[PDB]
Design a binder for this molecule. Structure first.
Ligand SMILES: CC(=O)O[C@H]1C[C@@]2(C)[C@@H](C[C@@H](O)[C@H]3[C@@]4(C)CC[C@@H](O)[C@@H](C)[C@@H]4CC[C@@]32C)/C1=C(\CCC=C1CCCC1)C(=O)O
Ligand SMILES: Nc1nc2c(ncn2[C@@H]2O[C@H](COP(=O)(O)OP(=O)(O)O)[C@@H](O)[C@H]2O)c(=O)[nH]1
Ligand SMILES: [Mg+2]
Ligand SMILES: [Mg+2]
Ligand SMILES: [Mg+2]
Ligand SMILES: [Mg+2]
Ligand SMILES: [Mg+2]
Ligand SMILES: [Mg+2]
Ligand SMILES: [Mg+2]
Ligand SMILES: [Mg+2]
Ligand SMILES: [Mg+2]
Ligand SMILES: [Mg+2]
Ligand SMILES: [Mg+2]
Lengths: 669, 80
RNA sequence: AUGGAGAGUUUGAUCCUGGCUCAGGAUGAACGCUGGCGGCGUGCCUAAUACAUGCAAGUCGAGCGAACGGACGAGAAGCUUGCUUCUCUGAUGUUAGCGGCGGACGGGUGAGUAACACGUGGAUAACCUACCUAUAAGACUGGGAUAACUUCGGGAAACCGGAGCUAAUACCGGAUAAUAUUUUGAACCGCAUGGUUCAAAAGUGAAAGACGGUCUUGCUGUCACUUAUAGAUGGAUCCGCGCUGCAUUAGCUAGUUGGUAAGGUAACGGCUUACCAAGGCAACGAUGCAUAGCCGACCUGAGAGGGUGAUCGGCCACACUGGAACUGAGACACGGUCCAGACUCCUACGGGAGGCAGCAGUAGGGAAUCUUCCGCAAUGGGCGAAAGCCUGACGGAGCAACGCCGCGUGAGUGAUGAAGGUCUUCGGAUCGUAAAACUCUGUUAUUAGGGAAGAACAUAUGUGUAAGUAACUGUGCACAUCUUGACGGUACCUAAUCAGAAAGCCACGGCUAACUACGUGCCAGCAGCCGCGGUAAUACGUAGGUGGCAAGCGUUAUCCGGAAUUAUUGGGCGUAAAGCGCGCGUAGGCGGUUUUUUAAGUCUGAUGUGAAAGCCCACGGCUCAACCGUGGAGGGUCAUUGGAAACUGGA
């Protein structure tokens, strides 16, 4: 009938932070407080705070699970960034901060764990300023640290809250203590200056020395936050129930609504160039983005989607504009702190779960049947680690393929593909932990035990020395008589130039009919390895002389002659084995540049160069693909998780003597 | 389980108790009458009459069928 | 008479034989491309796989006690006569519980079943039947409990016990009543056993009240109750005949076959037990193995036949698996009970719970099959005196070109053969009256108005009439009136605006309707068969044109046809596949001429039946048609009965 909460009272927020910062504890406390006049599950939970609807998505911290952070920030409006008080900003805090910046999501910072030993609110704020270069300012002050932490001074209203217990109840609202009054006034001045740096009207009002009203200051903070120019910093301890109510109040006061957020732009299916703006309007056409897909053992497949514009009722038909198919919405569910509720309708700015959608994966657009809009999808990182996977029992390969398909639908960042050259199935993921979890899930949930290893590297062969060679084949002894003869000069071609066949035949000594057959025989014999079984590349074969018989000459005979010529050329030209070399670009803070270059040179690679980029450094190198195994883990260990890299096939290079000998021995036996 | 089904369970148990009591009584009377007829006793006719009374009351209660009661009476009164 | 088509391919060529292949029809179809609408149908064929969640069986207060509730309207004035308690009356009402009836129907499924399961025709003098109808006779007199409820105790829950009290149309004794049981006599009759009627006696139990009218507690209406005999309905058993593959399955059977006695059952019966005997089945296919629900019907075929057993109707069987009984008229019971088993779930760890092959839906399997929708308004069912409650039966709506049927995507004029594509002999030909342009229409579509039928009723209110009454109320019937629609403001109708939103698929070597240009060059590729492709490709890909169809068109799968290619209709065995190497001989098949007789086959007439729906013919109603409805015709190797004697069979 009528939406229980208006667009002006909706808050779609995500809790994000470094590992063990307290995201789950904070979410649990928030749910408990919203539910009182708690198991955390499902993509999003719906609650109510002070007449406002709050959708909460709790995100993972590990860099291995950046997919969840991406897919949540895509559909969310605001974010709460949690910081450990003792350490402030950490590497995954930085990563989630950059993701939120890329998605233009307003953020409020919350310094959790104030009661922990070593907690330093000022140091955490300084880390916000330095590590992130963020216009963040406190809107509160902590009275006490560690066990002494006992009150929070709200600076906007210059009011102290004293917490008398860890239960989160019986908070005393009092005036700021006199000894802390000067510090509170200084902090309020700093906050006002920070906001005024973005607001010109507030800047003039502050320069005029006139007192700032509470409502005016709250409005200015809201404007700056929703513009993503300011970051309010709060403090508390979710474990001991201090500051959670203040954090919720800040969520209401400063984080935006689906109206305050910037609009969404999509492309018409039939007019990709055409742009459609989908504002938060119930009366507009229905468009929503499916951001999560799971299987609930009780209700079946659940599709969690965020609705941007329009409304949609359960028990109807919608269009999957991305797939261009029709989906039956049979049931709509919303997950609360303790139970799931069936809801008959979903409006703009609501996160819900549909039951009965078939062939609707994450990132799909669900639009009204008549409409054909397509909203912007999500971009996820490319794989950073690759492993060759294979079932321990070959009888489960079909089960393995089906499990891989289902897992790829569940997880965008997990990829599986077959390599033609090596015939191996390779799984790519965001990290060792990611791949280990996926392997265990395949083993147990899908009952396909698999073993994983380093992917095989497809080597090549080449000729290092030039030589003129002859291939003759005479088979007149029995029955049909065959004759073939060729004289070919094999030359090391310029690396990367590929095979080049030249026909320097004079006088028709080799009939022009058989020359293509000679070239084809050379191509086949080069496809077959001459030193270790790998294809031969980068060779110039010049057919410069030969002989033929008016009857015995045949295409097969000349192919035999070409094969013999290649065999003798392999005997005489000292072939070598080539290995793929990857152009590798490594981005990291300069303080780890020496470690990165040392690791590159230890991987048998060479450092091509270095160059600043933004606030970090980029190192360009060439490393063997074989030596690039497990590089992401080493890079993260060297850079405290701050280093990233990309690698692309660049060229082939000669394998060292010992490595080539080992390869030859392995292939022979 | 249906409400009426639970109720029917209760009523079935009650009816079974009553029916088994009555059937046991009538069977005992029938056996006594048969023994008295087999070995002549001064109580023979009275026992046979009691057996017939209980047999007919059982047939009317539907514990046994009318034809079953008829067979019992026929054999009992042919022996007697 | 209503009905029957062939073609390619073995060769240098030929005729024959012979297989392979194609043109037709069909589908619960799937897939590929494409896709406008309406009507009527159809839609998990796979996993009788497992199932979250909601709903699918209740009803009766006019059977019963109790509890809650509190009108209408009592009393004191708090001086508030509008608000107040208990000392009342307490009506209209509601309910957990006892009791009655219904949960055995309705709905699902096809696992099992090769069997009197099913079909057809018969039989029961071997049977049973609540509710319903008719007739006749009754309903007399007493009693003891218990649920609920209160209290005490134990539990997470499921819920448990102990004590005390109270009802009934709950339960029980006694009284009278029999066509039922025993005995005796008599009469008549039949298909062995036996059946029907009459007369004597002995044993012998039934029941209940509720709501009203008249009020004389006497009479009495409706409903309900009991006994007996009939009707109706439903069920049970037996039997002839029919109904499937294999002998690379030949022996099977020991309660087995018969008799006697008893027990048991609604009922007959080795149904079961005790005894005696050694019988019973089987090449006319026993036994074993495999597969299968059967039928009406459905597809195909000229027919004979062949294939199938969705939707709809009948019969059967099953309800997680196996066994059992209870209650009951009826079950050995889908949403009952007990036990065992597998599996699953909850738990406070003490202990508890469950069965979608009901309707939706989930997971899974799959090439593949739908909404966790609306309403009891119609029809039907259960309960109720009735209003009414319940009803995922059912009536509707939603989805799917899945099928069939209907209508669109425009119509008239239009040479001036316009541009442009393709080909060209460079003249022209063709797309083409196609286009452009003028004129016209609005089926459709958009907008705005009007708007059905399906609805009969039941009940209630008025009278009239009929049995009974001493007379009413009531009961049956008849005529009137108020009211009852999920679909749905849907179908349909009217008015205005626009050709504007609405054509795709396959094929073009022969079979087989439709040919040319470029690209390729035994490659890429096509292909149902024969085959095509190596520079002149009507066979590969594209383009123009053409052909067939058209909201569908192609492909794949399966069935019948063509196939006389298992040949009864309707073929063969010298050389094409095919005469056992040859005797002797059993069963079986077949059998010379005449006469008399029988009526098993054979022929002919009558009667009953072969449900309904379906097919075919006719008619009627949706604007047509599909579809729907109503009559007719058809379908048996069917049965009973009466006739003929030529042939086959018997004497
Ligand atoms: C916020 C939240 O609930 O995070 C959860 C949800 C989470 C992000 C999970 C980690 C991981 O299993 C994730 C992946 C990517 C795993 C692969 C696929 O199965 C996909 C579909 C899957 C999607 C999400 C998922 C299930 C979480 C998590 C981290 C667990 C911590 C660990 C420490 C070492 C061992 C692991 C957490 O508790 O923070
Ligand atoms: N001392 C302290 N410990 C905390 C606080 N908040 C959370 N923790 C604990 O620190 C850990 C954080 O883990 P969790 O809350 O799951 O964080 P996440 O990794 O961000 O989801 C847990 O062991 C918490 O109990 C806090 O405010 N103070
Ligand atoms: Mg967490
Ligand atoms: Mg079967
Ligand atoms: Mg024929
Ligand atoms: Mg039942
Ligand atoms: Mg069930
Ligand atoms: Mg079902
Ligand atoms: Mg599947
Ligand atoms: Mg034939
Ligand atoms: Mg021969
Ligand atoms: Mg011979
Ligand atoms: Mg018929």
């Amino acid at each position: 009938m009528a939406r229980e909460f208006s667009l002006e009272k909706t808050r779609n927020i995500g809790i994000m932070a470094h590992i063990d910062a307290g995201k789950t504890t904070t979410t649990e406390r928030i749910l408990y407080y919203t539910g009182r006049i708690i198991t955390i599950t499902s993509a999003a939970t719906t609650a109510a705070w002070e007449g406002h609807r709050v959708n909460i998505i709790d995100t993972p911290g590990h860099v291995d699970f950046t997919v969840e952070v991406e897919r949540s920030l895509r559909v969310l409006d605001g974010a709460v960034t949690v910081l450990d008080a003792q350490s402030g900003v950490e590497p995954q805090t930085e990563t989630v901060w950059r993701q939120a910046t890329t998605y233009g999501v307003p953020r409020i910072v919350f310094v959790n764990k104030m009661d922990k030993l070593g907690a330093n609110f000022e140091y955490s704020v300084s880390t916000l300023h330095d590590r992130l270069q963020a216009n963040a300012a406190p809107i509160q002050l902590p009275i006490g640290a560690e066990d002494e932490f006992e009150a929070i001074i709200d600076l906007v209203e210059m009011k102290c809250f004293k917490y008398t217990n860890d239960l989160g109840t019986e908070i005393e609202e009092i005036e700021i203590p006199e000894d802390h009054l000067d510090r509170a006034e200084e902090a309020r001045a700093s906050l006002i200056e920070a906001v005024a740096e973005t607001s010109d009207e507030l800047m003039e009002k502050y320069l005029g020395d006139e007192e700032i009203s509470v409502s005016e200051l709250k409005e200015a903070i809201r404007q700056a936050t929703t513009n993503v120019e300011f970051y309010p910093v709060l403090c508390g301890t979710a474990f001991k129930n201090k500051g959670v109510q203040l954090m919720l109040d800040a969520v209401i006061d400063y984080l935006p609504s689906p109206l305050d957020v910037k609009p969404i732009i999509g492309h018409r299916a039939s007019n990709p160039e055409e742009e459609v703006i989908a504002k938060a309007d119930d009366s507009a056409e229905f468009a929503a983005l499916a951001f999560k897909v799971m299987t609930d053992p009780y209700v079946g497949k659940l599709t969690f989607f965020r609705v941007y514009s329009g409304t949609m009722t359960s028990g109807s038909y919608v269009k999957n504009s991305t797939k261009g198919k029709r989906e039956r919405v049979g049931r709509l569910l919303q997950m609360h702190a303790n139970s799931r509720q069936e809801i008959d309708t979903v409006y703009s700015g609501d996160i819900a779960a549909a039951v009965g959608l078939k062939d609707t994966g994450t990132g799909d657009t669900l639009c009204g049947e008549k409409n054909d809009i397509i909203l912007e999808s999500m971009e996820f990182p490319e794989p950073v680690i690759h492993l060759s996977v294979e079932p321990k029992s070959k009888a489960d390969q079909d089960k393995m393929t089906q499990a891989l398909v289902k897992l790829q639908e569940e997880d965008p960042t997990f990829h599986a593909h077959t390599d033609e050259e090596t015939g191996q199935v390779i799984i790519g993921g965001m990290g060792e932990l990611h791949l280990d979890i996926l392997v265990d899930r395949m083993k147990k949930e899908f009952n396909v035990e698999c073993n994983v290893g380093a992917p095989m590297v497809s080597y090549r062969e080449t000729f290092k020395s030039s030589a003129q060679v002859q291939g003759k084949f005479s088979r007149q002894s029995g029955g049909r008589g065959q004759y073939g003869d060729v004289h070919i000069e094999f030359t090391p071609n310029e690396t990367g130039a590929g095979f080049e066949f030249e026909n320097a035949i004079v006088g028709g000594v080799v009939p022009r009919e058989y020359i293509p057959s000679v070239e084809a025989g050379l191509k086949d014999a080069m496809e077959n390895g001459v030193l270790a079984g790998y294809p031969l590349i980068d060779v110039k074969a010049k057919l410069y002389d030969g002989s033929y018989h008016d009857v015995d000459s045949s295409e097969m005979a000349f192919k035999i002659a070409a094969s013999l010529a290649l065999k003798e050329a392999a005997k005489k030209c000292d072939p070598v084995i080539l290995e793929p070399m990857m152009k590798v670009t490594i981005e990291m803070p300069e303080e780890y540049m020496g470690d990165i270059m040392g690791d590159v040179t230890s991987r048998r690679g060479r450092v091509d160069g270095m160059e600043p980029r933004g606030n970090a450094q980029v190192v360009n190198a060439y490393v063997p693909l074989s030596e690039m195994f497990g590089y992401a883990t080493s890079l993260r260990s060297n850079t405290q998780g701050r280093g990233t890299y990309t690698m692309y096939f660049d060229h082939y290079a000669e394998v060292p003597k010992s490595i080539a000998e080992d390869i030859i021995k392995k292939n022979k036996g | 389980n249906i409400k009426s089904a639970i109720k029917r369970v209760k009523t079935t148990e009650k009816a079974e108790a009553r029916n088994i009591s009555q059937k046991s009584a009538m069977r005992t009377a029938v056996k006594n009458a048969k023994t008295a007829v087999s070995n002549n006793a001064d109580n023979k006719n009275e026992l046979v009459s009691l057996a017939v009374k209980l047999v007919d009351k059982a047939a009317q209660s539907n514990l046994i069928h009318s034809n079953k009661a008829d067979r019992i009476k026929s054999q009992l009164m042919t022996a007697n």
